[PDB]
Amino acid sequence: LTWHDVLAEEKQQPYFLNTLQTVASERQSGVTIYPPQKDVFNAFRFTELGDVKVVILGQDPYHGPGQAHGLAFSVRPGIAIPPSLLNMYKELENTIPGFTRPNHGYLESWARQGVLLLNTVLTVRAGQAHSHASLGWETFTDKVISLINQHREGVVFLLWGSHAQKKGAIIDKQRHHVLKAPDPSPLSAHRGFFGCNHFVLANQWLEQRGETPIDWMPVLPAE
Amino acid sequence: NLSDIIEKETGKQLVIQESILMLPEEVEEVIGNKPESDILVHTAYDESTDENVMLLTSDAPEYKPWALVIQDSNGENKIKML
Numbered sequence: 001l002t003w004h005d006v007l008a009e010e011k012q013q014p015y016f017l018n019t020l021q022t023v024a025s026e027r028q029s030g031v032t033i034y035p036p037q038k039d040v041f042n043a044f045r046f047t048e049l050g051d052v053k054v055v056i057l058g059q060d061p062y063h064g065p066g067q068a069h070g071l072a073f074s075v076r077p078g079i080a081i082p083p084s085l086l087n088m089y090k091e092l093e094n095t096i097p098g099f100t101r102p103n104h105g106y107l108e109s110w111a112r113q114g115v116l117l118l119n120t121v122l123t124v125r126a127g128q129a130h131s132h133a134s135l136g137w138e139t140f141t142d143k144v145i146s147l148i149n150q151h152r153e154g155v156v157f158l159l160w161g162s163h164a165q166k167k168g169a170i171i172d173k174q175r176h177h178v179l180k181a182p183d184p185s186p187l188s189a190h191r192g193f194f195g196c197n198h199f200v201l202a203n204q205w206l207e208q209r210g211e212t213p214i215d216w217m218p219v220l221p222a223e
Numbered sequence: 224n225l226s227d228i229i230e231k232e233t234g235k236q237l238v239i240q241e242s243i244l245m246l247p248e249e250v251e252e253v254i255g256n257k258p259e260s261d262i263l264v265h266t267a268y269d270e271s272t273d274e275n276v277m278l279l280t281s282d283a284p285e286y287k288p289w290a291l292v293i294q295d296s297n298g299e300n301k302i303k304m305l
Binding site: 059063080082130131161162163185186187188190 | 248
């Protein structure tokens with residue numbers, strides 16, 4: 001069960017080719033888009049289908065230079081921790097034993113442990129937030145979540161904010177564990193995200209199923 | 224641009240780190256006023272005061288300024304309609 005195996009038929013779809021072609025055309029026309037084309041599918045690269053244990057949905061990649069690199073919420077090394085990720089940290093410190101706030105926002109180690117850090121829209125025009133929505137990525141990421149709901153069993157979904165929560169409609173809630181809560185954005189963290197305990201609840205669900213829990217402390221690769 | 228609108232109301236020069244999309248119902252509670260459409264919460268951090276300056280606008284490509292929210296080290300907002 002790999003991505004190339006289940007997504008092969010979807011790569012052929014007219015709407016999908018339309019999207020990649022629009023993005024590519026814009027890049028060719030001098031429109032800077034993030035992340036670099038080489039990093040657009042990193043989430044699937046780092047986390048294969050049989051390895052998906054936790055699914056955390058984001059919206060679109062960061063629109064600033066050097067921030068995004070294919071993973072949701074994660075920023076490259078040397079980039080300031082974005083406010084939301086910071087609040088994700090504040091909740092982890094409060095709940096996960098042994099967790100101390102990191103000094104970066106690079107989450108490759110999460111992806112390596114089975115956390116599919118997926119943004120619903122995989123690209124953005126530099127400087128303009130949400131510039132690539134209603135362009136095809138949503139349909140694609142809808143199928144991706146549909147494929148996970150289908151071929152897998154017991155995956156714990158972490159849906160933050162009402163936008164993300166809408167994608168729970170295609171997830172059988174008896175087949176998969178779905179945890180809802182408001183977005184970790186400073187504006188909304190104080191109405192349900194803080195104290196949601198999503199991280200510890202996620203690991204408890206993973207241990208009560210034979211799977212090895214996630215070590216939420218992110219690590220930095222050398223040099 | 225959006226960064227100037229932040230400097231226009233607060234006098235502080237900050238870079239927008241993230242822009243989180245939010246539905247009318249979500250921002251209705253916190254702000255205490257339901258917006259006409261989807262809102263983008265443009266968030267910038269100001270370590271100088273440990274505050275979070277959030278510039279809320281309508282969705283792309285209009286980005287019509289809706290309000291300015293400042294949150295302090297106590298998670299308390301200071302809302303200002305634009």
